[PDB]
Each structure stands twice: as structure tokens, then as C-alpha cells.
Amino acid sequence: ILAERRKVLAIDHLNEDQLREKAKELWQSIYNLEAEKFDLQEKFKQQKYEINVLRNRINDNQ
Amino acid sequence: DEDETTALVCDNGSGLVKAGFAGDDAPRAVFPSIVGRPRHQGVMVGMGQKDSYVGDEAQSKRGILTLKYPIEHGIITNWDDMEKIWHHTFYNELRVAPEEHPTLLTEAPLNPKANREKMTQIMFETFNVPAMYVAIQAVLSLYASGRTTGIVLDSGDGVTHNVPIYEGYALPHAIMRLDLAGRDLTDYLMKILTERGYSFVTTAEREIVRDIKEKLCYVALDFENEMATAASSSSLEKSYELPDGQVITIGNERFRCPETLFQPSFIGMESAGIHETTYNSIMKCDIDIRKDLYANNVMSGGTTMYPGIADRMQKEITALAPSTMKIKIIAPPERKYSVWIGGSILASLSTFQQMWITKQEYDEAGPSIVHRKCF
Amino acid sequence: DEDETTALVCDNGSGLVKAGFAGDDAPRAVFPSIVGRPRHQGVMVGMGQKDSYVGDEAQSKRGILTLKYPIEHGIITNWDDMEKIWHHTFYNELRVAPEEHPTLLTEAPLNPKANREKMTQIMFETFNVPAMYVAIQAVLSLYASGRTTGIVLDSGDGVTHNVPIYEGYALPHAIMRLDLAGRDLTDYLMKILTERGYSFVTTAEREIVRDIKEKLCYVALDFENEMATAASSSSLEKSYELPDGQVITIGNERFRCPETLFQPSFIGMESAGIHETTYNSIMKCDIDIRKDLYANNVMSGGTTMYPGIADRMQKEITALAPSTMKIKIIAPPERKYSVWIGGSILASLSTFQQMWITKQEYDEAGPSIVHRKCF
Amino acid sequence: ISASRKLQLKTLLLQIAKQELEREAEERRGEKGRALSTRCQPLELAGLGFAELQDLCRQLHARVDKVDEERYDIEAKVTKNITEIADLTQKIFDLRGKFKRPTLRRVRISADAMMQALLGARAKES
Amino acid sequence: DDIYKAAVEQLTEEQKNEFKAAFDIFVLGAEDGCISTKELGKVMRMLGQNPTPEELQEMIDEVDEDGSGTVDFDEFLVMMVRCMKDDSKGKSEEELSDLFRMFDKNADGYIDLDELKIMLQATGETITEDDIEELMKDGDKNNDGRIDYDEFLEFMKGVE
């Protein structure tokens, strides 16, 4: 699956221009995956906080 | 919740997993090695209800669950259930994150390598532990007891390993692996309680009989004297309260069950008995070793808690032993807990800090590393 | 006010039909399961006059009607009559068309499948309901009472079902249904009132005796003491007023009617009674279940409304039960209406919406679908 | 004091905690913007040679794969913590319940209808 | 009741006079002059409804805050603005978590006294430190000086 999200990179038939295009599109994909990573990190931090509170209530509930 | 990267210690038996952190003198909790599953069809809506329950959850909701153990005479055969037991142990009750701690597990030295290799694999691959060690139960009871020499007799829930140690060394030709333990004693008791009119078959019933044995049974220093007396008079009966308000009284069954340890033939087993296997582990050692093992008959695990067993085992070996030799049982209060305790001591020894398998060594070496680094 | 397509809830028994909208805490009205028909030759013309009358219409015009019940001993025997009972229930009094609302109907756990299949068929084919579910009355009784665990003892008009539930799961092997119910108690009372000189056999008369039972019976926690005095003195007789101004006084017969629930042989039934079926449902469950069922006998149905039945039942179960154990009865005001109340609770749960049979699923599979999806 | 003042105080607490959620979200989103500009800096494509462009494509593709897998790990963690929050809230609400099932009532019918049906000519304001 | 206390305060003097005349018609034959059992009964039969006595006593004693045992004209206004429901949607557990991560500025799990202090002081209306202490005690059911999550829910459940 890591291999599946490892997309196909075909850069032989691409001349210099389509090489620039492929490099930039891979860069943009990197940017978007960094975006999802940061969002899931913020969600996970809010989650760890709320789970601190949840175990607080658990101690209060049991 | 720990303030140091102390090693974790977990003693995974067929009965319960004892667990806590290295440096303590006791596990934080004992987690029965049980995964329960509902055996009935739900009728009400909005009841929650999970596909499985683990450890104490499995026992607390047992009225409608079928309960099974993942460990067979010391070897884990059901790894899905042990991951749930281990996860629950670290995640909910020990309040532990193994990623930040070395972990020490225990095992009989006589069990198939598959178990020590797989335990090493799960802590590194599922729990991401930075380091591992799997320790020998003969060793662990001896550390807990303050001994370097002796015959270690577990008579546990799963297996009896019968292993002689001298000056910290194994004497392997004198080892008696025995397929007799508390799980067999319990089944025997269910059959003889059936003779009395109380039929115990299902999970709730199996857990009741294990509780009856734990609270009412003893081995007897002299079986025949207790046998003849208990079979002749009600003065030897002891009562037990069944959960529904009914009661059971138990007579000579109170000792006939534990007696199987000395007489394996009671359950169809072909065996010398725990006192002879202990004896043979002393006897098969060299002549200049024998005297030290006679003086160091070392208890490990549970069942060593039965009334008359520490006095009986010493008498049974004495009866087989040569004269001159002084025979003694080492039966500390660290009973039923000495293997875990030994793990705490061992994990913490300065002399043991290089015995740990690190994550990097594991990844380069593969799972077979346990054979080269642990035992 | 109903500004939301809330599910409609109706409990259709051999006695009466409880109906209202999900989200309320009571049926809006109780419609007896009666279809009345004229049994006399008309002489006047332009008098209106229906082919049949339903529910309260059937009782209001009963002076010349024969009154029939479409439901008997827990099941629908006449579903064309039920379509009329339901049409009236929904369109004349609740004033709602099921076409725009899911509908929840209820039955006992071992009730013959034809009952749930016809409930499903009529609501989908004559009412065009967008969805259906047939629920178990025992679930609903537990939901109304705030329980997940207990014995539901539901003696109603045509049947006593007796079903143990633990953690929301049915224990079906421990269900003990009886052909013992309020309709038979009415018949027993008619025979003993006949012995007193008040012979009741026609529909109007049968309805009067039922009304007498509801207002005069007290069951008796100690029936031997009550018969000794009630049969000896007028001081324990209660006067009942009849529609034509007559007065009937009833003495030990006042409790002999309910006594049949403890002595079923009174109506020709081979049974140990309602207190024993409650007890046997506990006894056929595992011993780690029994403690919770003993502490939670759950009263449902209508016989639970005698002024003294809770004490009659607790005394009988504790008499049958082991000592030490605590035997308790849960007897909330949600009596006689607990199924409807539970129906509203179920219908409104978020955890129940996926349980509905939709009209599309019904049209593709036919009414037998209810047997596969509901329970 | 007037309890309308108390309603105003509590609804202002609600709105102000909403604006505090907004300021915390503003912190998090500014962090996201800066850490995204730095996590993946805009490329410079002009002048780079053919083989060098293929090497850069290989690098950026491997980085695609790796940051994908990393956000995927944080996603798995988020899923675990979603299950955790949901199930711990279920457990608590059970310990905080078994009596806390929400009930609806429709005796709470709109006051205007019965207001009219009762007062007639004088029931004009409510 | 701050919701429906604002609701009655949302009424104009004309609505109050109408409800006063309705109260005058309400108690025709009242032994208490207030809305007791028979008053509810007669004003319900005034339209033709037949409720149960237990529901009636429930409605009497619930809106009775002091333990007077009857419904006074003020409680009558409360039930009048009750059936015309004003406080919509009662922002709740998830919104309250969005609010509670803020309330607990410490990111620990409990709204500390300085935290709820800043929270109230930022509301804009008249803010005393008594507000902070008592909203603590009412939120923090433990009165430990720290409002837990569930404590914040029951602190702000149903609040418009």
C-alpha cells in the first residue's frame, strides 16, 4: 500500500518541459500530504487533550 | 505514567498475567489470561456490547460469555487473544507506553522456541518496544528468593518445569519437563464434585471450581491419613458459597484434587509425580552437586501455597534421599509471585543491562535473535 | 404537537391496544381489541348503523352487538379486523396517516411468526407505511423500567410469556410460556359468581365481569388467611354496581379469580403458576446470571396491577429461591403500559434507526422479511 | 438580579468560548500555513538540466510517497483517537447514564394554539 | 430558567396584562387563588383536555421553586413562555467540547479558576468574580475549582 501510494514516476519519455511539470506536480502532492499530516496532527493533539479529559471523567465515572 | 524508562515486566502464564514495572516488588495487577466472547443472541437495542472482553472484563461479564485461555501449558497458541491481553494491560491498567520502555517477559526454558521468538516479535513489531528479554522461570524464582542454587518446582497452572540450577548454571540433563499442572487438577476436581452431586461443565462453573480449589483445597502432609479420616467424618468437610445462594460442601475431594500432583495417575498421566521429578533432578546431577540441591528445593509459582505441600515435598524427597544429606524446602511468601518479582530484579541488574536485545539488533538479526541473546 | 415524522407506536394484545406517537410517555388512547357487530333485526330506517364498530365504538354501542377479539393468546387470528382496529387508531383518534411515519408493532419472544408477518404485511400493504419493525415486548418492558437485566413476567389478557434477559441478551432456553392470563381469570370469576347467584354469559355480561375483576380483585399475599376470613364474613365483601342498578357483593371470590395465577388448575391449565415460571426462568440461566435475575423480577403485562401482587410474587419467588440471595421485584407505575412506553423509547433511539424494514426492502422480499431482520 | 441578565451572561460565555475556539483555530491554521510553506517550499524549475530534472522528479516522487505515508500514519492515529473518544464517551455516558436517555415530550404543545382557543379576542400578543 | 426568564422578559407589557387577565379567568373558584389542582383541572376542561392527576402534581411542584405547593402567577408566566419555546437547540456536548478546550486554557481537562475567570471577563456583560466562583461550583460539580468536561456539559447543556 505504501507502494500503491507510491505513484508511478515516468520521466524518460518526458522532455525537459514535462520533467519540470512532473517535478512541480510531485512537489504539490508533497504539499498536500504535508497539509493532511498537519491537520491530522492538530486533530490528534485536540484528541489527546480531550482524552486526558475523558480519562478524568472516567476517574470521575469509575 | 512512570518518570523513568524502567523496564516493564510481564509474567504470561496459562492462568494470569502478572504485570507491573521493574523496580517494584509486586505487579500492579494480575490480568487473567482470558478473552471472553458472548455465547447468546442480543435482544435489546442500544446495549453497547462488544464481540469480546479481556482479562477482568472477561470475568466480570462471564455470566453470558464463553471464556478461553490463549496459553497451553506455557505456550501461547492464540496470539490474537494475547495481543488484546497485552494491549489492555499496558493501555488501560498499567498506564504504560512500551514504546518508551524495555520489556521483560518470562517463559519455561523447556518450551518450544516458537513462543520465545514470537513474544520477542510482538513486543518489537506490535508494541514497538526499544528492547527485549525473555527470562527463564527457574532463574526468576531463584532471584526473588535470594538463591543461586536449587531445584525449581513450579507446579503452576500450566507446566511444571523441574529445573536444577547450581551456582547460577543450568544442569540440563537432570531436567524433568512435566505435563501436569493446576489446569488438570481443576478438571479432576470437577469430576469428583460431579460424584457428590454438583455438575460443573460450563464457563461459569469452571471458574467456580477453580475458586473452590483455591480457597478449600490442600495436599495433606500424609494423604492416606487425611483420606481415611475425610472419607469417614463430616468434621473434614469445608463449605463454599456458589454465586446463586446455593452451597456445596467438599470432603476428601478437598485433597484428592491436589494429590494428583503427587499421583498423576489420577488424571491418566504417566508420570513420576512432582516429588519424584524434583528428586530425579537432584539425583541426576553430579555427586558433588547433589548435596547443595538437596538443601535447596526451591518453590516457584502457585499450588506451592497448598497446606502440607512444603512439609510433604521435604518428607517425600527425604524418603528417597540418601542418609547424611540434609533436605530443605525454600518456600518464601514471594510464592505465586516470585517469577514476576525475579523479572523486576533481573531487569534492573547492572550485570543484565547488556543482556537486552535492542530494537536495532532485532531488526538486523531477525526473530531468531532470542536464541542467541536470551536463552 | 407532532411536527416530525416520528414513528408511530402500537401494542396490539388480546385485550387492549395501546397507541400513541413515539416520543410521548404514554399511549394517547387505549383502544380495546374489539370489533363489534349487530346481532338483532332492525325495525327503524335512517338510523345510521355500521356493519361493524371498533374499539371504543364497539363498547359504546355494545347493548346490541356481539363483541369479538381479533387477537387471541398472543397472536392475530383475524388481520382484516386488525386493519380496521388500526385504521381507527391511526386516522380517527391519533389522526395520523402511517404513510408518512415508520410504525412499530410488538410481540412476545417465541410468538408464532405469523403474528409478525401479518403485522408487517398489513402496515405495508393497506397503510403504505414507509417502514416497519416488530419489537419484542420484553425489551420494551425493560426499557420502560430502566433495566437491561431481569425476568420479564408479562401476564396479560391472553398469555404469560416469562422471558429472562441478561445484559440485553435473551436466554431463550429459559423461557416458559403459559396459557394462563387475565381472560381466563375473568372466566373463572364468571363461574364462581354464578355459584353466588349472578350468572354472567353474554357479551354485555362478560364485559361486566371483566370490569369487576379490574376494580375488586386484590390477589392476596396470603390467600389461605384471606379465604379463611373472606369466606366466613361479609366484612370482607366488596359491593360492585352493575349498569342496570344491580349490586353484586363478592367475598373470597374477589381473590379466587387471581388465585388461578398461582393455581392454574382452576381454569384447567397444567401449570405451576406465574411465580414458578418466574423462578424457573431464573433457574435455567447460568449461576452468574441468576443473581441479577433474582434481584430483578420485572413486572409487565396487566396482572401486575392488583393491590398486593408485588408482595404475593416476592413472597413466592423468595420461598422457591435459595437463602442468602436477595429476591426483588421491579414494579414501576409504567405498569400495564410498559410495552408502549418501551416502544416509544425504542422507536426514538438513534441506535434503532438501522433496524427498520423499509418499504423497499418489504416490497422486494415480502412479509417473511420480518422474521429475518427483527429478532 | 434579573435572570434575563443571566441568560445574556451564559450566551455570551457560549459566544466567547466560540471566539476562543476561533483564536485557537487561528493559531493552528497560521501554524499550518507557515509549516506548509516550509514543509514544502515552492520549487524553482527554470534552467535545471534534463538529467537533473529527472533526479529532481525522483526526489520529489519519493517525497510524495513518504509524506503520504506520514500523513497516513497520523491519520491512523487520528482514527484510533476517534474510536477512543467515541468509546470512552460511550462508557462515561453509561456511567453517566443508564438513567440519562433523552426523552421528548409533546404535552409541550405550542402555547399559541391553546392561547387562541382559550382567550379569543384578547389572545393577540401570544 | 434564564432562558424562559428572558422569554417572559421578552414579553411586552401588553402580553403581561393579557396573561394577568388569563390568570384572573384561571382561578375561578380557587381556594388558593393560585393554580392548584382544581385550577388546572377547570382550565383544562375549559378547552376539553383530560390529563392525569400525577402529571398535574408534577407540573405544580416542578415550577414551584420554593416549595409553595402551587403555581403562582409568575410560574404561570413561566409555563406560558414554556409552551412557546424560545431557547433553541441548546448548544451541547460537541460544541461544548469546542468551548471546553478553550475554557480549559491549560489544555489539561479542567477549567481552572483563572481560566473560567478570563472566559467570563471576556463575555462583555457585567462580570464579577462571583460569576466565576459560582459558575465554577455549578459547572465543577465537585466544586474543586476545576470544571471537568462533563462538568462543562451539564454546566452549559441546553443553554441557548
Strand B238-241 and strand B169-170: the pairing is: unpaired
Nearest 5 degrees, angle CA B302-CA B303-CA B307?
Answer: 130
Smallest CA-to-CA distance from B161 within B215, B106, B217, B119 is with B106
Q: CA E44, CA E56: separation in Å to the nearest integer?
A: 11
Nearest 5 degrees, angle CA E133-CA E138-CA E144?
Answer: 65
Q: CA B356, CA B135: separation in Å to the nearest integer?
A: 11
C-alpha cell at D86: 467515541
Smallest CA-to-CA distance from C262 within C250, C252, C271 is with C271
**Burial (CB count <10 Å: 0-12, 13-18, 19+), residue B164:** buried
Determine, for residues A27 and D75 on separate chains, whether the beta-carbon distance falls below 8 Å.
no
Alpha helices for C64-220 (secondary structure H): 79-87, 113-125, 137-145, 182-195, 203-216
Amino acid in position C244 = D
Breaks in chain B, after residue numbers (C to N greater than 2.5 Å): none
Q: Which domains does chain B have, with CATH numbers?
A: 4-34+71-134+337-371 (3.30.420.40), 35-68 (2.30.36.70), 136-181+271-332 (3.30.420.40), 182-267 (3.90.640.10)
What is the per-residue DSSP string for A3-62?
HHHS-----SS--HHHHHHHHHHHHHHHHHHHHHHHHHHHHHHHHHHHHHHHHHHHHHH-
b (16+ CB within 10 A) / e for E148-157: bbbbbbebbe
What is the per-residue DSSP string for C192-221?
HHHHTT----SHHHHHHHHHHHHHH----S
C-alpha cell at B195: 460424584
Determine, for residues D106 and C348 on separate chains, whether the beta-carbon distance falls below 8 Å.
no
* Largest CA-CA distance found in chain B, in angstroms, rounded: 74
C-alpha cell at E152: 462543562
Question: Which chain D residues in 34-53 lie under 8 Å from chain A, judged by CB atoms?
Answer: 35-36, 39-40, 42-43, 45, 48-50, 53
Q: For chain B, list residues whose CB is within 8 angstroms of any CB belonging to chain C.
A: 38, 40-47, 49, 61-64, 202, 204-205, 208, 241-246
Smallest CA-to-CA distance from C22 within C119, C131, C134, C102 is with C102
Cα C287 to the center of its chain, rounded Å: 30
Residues whose CB is less than 8 angstroms from the CB of residue B111 and which lie 6 or more positions away in sequence, other chains included: B74, B75, B159
Backbone angles phi, psi at C104, to 5 degrees: -105, 115
Smallest CA-to-CA distance from C343 within C76, C116, C74, C7 is with C7
Q: CA B306, CA B318: separation in Å to the nearest integer?
A: 19
Q: CA D67, CA C105: separation in Å to the nearest integer?
A: 54
What is the per-residue DSSP string for chain D?
--HHHHHHHHHHHHHHHHHHHHHHHHHHHHHHHHHHHHHSPPP--TT--HHHHHHHHHHHHHHHHHHHHHHHHHHHHHHHHHHHHHHHHHHHHHHT-SS------SSS--HHHHHHHHHGGG----
In contact, B143 and B345? CB cutoff 8 Å: yes
HSE (CB half, 13 Å, CA atoms) of E138?
11
In contact, E81 and E6? CB cutoff 8 Å: no
Helix pair angle (D50-95, A16-61), 10° resolution: 20
Beta-carbon neighbour count of residue B320 at 10 Å? 15
Amino acid in position B284 = K
Q: CA E32, CA E38: separation in Å to the nearest integer?
A: 10
C-alpha cell at B241: 458459597
Smallest CA-to-CA distance from C61 within C47, C72, C74, C71 is with C47
Determine, for residues E2 and D4 on separate chains, whether the beta-carbon distance falls below 8 Å.
yes
Q: How many residues does chain B have?
A: 375
In contact, C110 and C175? CB cutoff 8 Å: yes
Q: CA E63, CA C227: separation in Å to the nearest integer?
A: 48
Q: CA B213, CA B203: separation in Å to the nearest integer?
A: 15
Q: DSSP character for B245? A: S
Q: Is D4 on the interface with E (CB under 8 A)?
A: yes
C-alpha cell at B310: 512444603
Q: CA E24, CA E43: separation in Å to the nearest integer?
A: 11
Q: CA B30, CA B157: separation in Å to the nearest integer?
A: 14
Q: Could you write out the three-class secondary structure of E56-102?
A: HHHHHHHHCCCCCCCECHHHHHHHHHHHCCCCCCCCCHHHHHHHHHH
In contact, C279 and C321? CB cutoff 8 Å: yes
List chain C residues with CB under 8 Å of B41: 169-170, 172, 375
In order of C181, E23, E29, E57, the CA distances from E38 in angstroms are 39, 14, 8, 11
Residues whose CB is less than 8 angstroms from the CB of residue B214 and which lie 6 or more positions away in sequence, other chains included: none
Dihedral angle over CA of D57, D60, D62, D64, nearest 10: -130
In contact, A44 and D81? CB cutoff 8 Å: yes
Helix pair angle (C203-216, C182-195), 10° resolution: 100
- What method was applied to determine this entry? cryo-EM
Q: CA C118, CA C82: separation in Å to the nearest integer?
A: 10
Q: CA D28, CA D26: separation in Å to the nearest integer?
A: 5
Q: CA C101, CA C47: separation in Å to the nearest integer?
A: 36
Chain C contact partners (≥3 CB pairs within 8 A) = B, D
Question: Which chain A residues in 38-57 lie under 8 Å from chain E, judged by CB atoms?
Answer: 46, 49-50, 52-57
Q: CA A29, CA A33: separation in Å to the nearest integer?
A: 6
Beta-carbon neighbour count of residue B322 at 10 Å? 9
In contact, C153 and C261? CB cutoff 8 Å: no
**H/E stretch holding B132:** strand B131-136
In order of A45, D110, E117, the CA distances from E159 in angstroms are 28, 20, 19
DSSP-based three-state secondary structure for C120: helix
Beta-carbon neighbour count of residue E49 at 10 Å? 12
Q: CA C187, CA C201: separation in Å to the nearest integer?
A: 9
Q: CA B249, CA B228: separation in Å to the nearest integer?
A: 17
Determine, for residues C290 and B244 on separate chains, whether the beta-carbon distance falls below 8 Å.
yes
Helix pair angle (E2-10, E73-83), 10° resolution: 90
Strand B53-54 and strand B35-38: the pairing is: antiparallel
Backbone angles phi, psi at C166, to 5 degrees: -130, 125
Q: Is E119 on the interface with D (CB under 8 A)?
A: yes
* Largest CA-CA distance found in chain C, in angstroms, rounded: 73
In contact, B152 and B161? CB cutoff 8 Å: yes
Smallest CA-to-CA distance from E61 within E79, E42, E43 is with E79
Q: Could you say which of B44, B202, B246 has the minimum Cβ distance to residue C168?
A: B44
**Burial (CB count <10 Å: 0-12, 13-18, 19+), residue B231:** exposed
C-alpha cell at B281: 533432578
Q: CA E80, CA D119: separation in Å to the nearest integer?
A: 13
Backbone angles phi, psi at B160, to 5 degrees: -110, 120
List chain E residues with CB under 8 Å of D24: 101-102
In contact, B73 and B310? CB cutoff 8 Å: no
CA dihedral for B57, B340, B96, E146, sign (positive or negative): positive
C-alpha cell at B72: 497451553
Smallest CA-to-CA distance from D11 within E6, B20, C59 is with E6
C-alpha cell at B306: 497448598
**Burial (CB count <10 Å: 0-12, 13-18, 19+), residue E125:** middle
DSSP-based three-state secondary structure for E47: coil
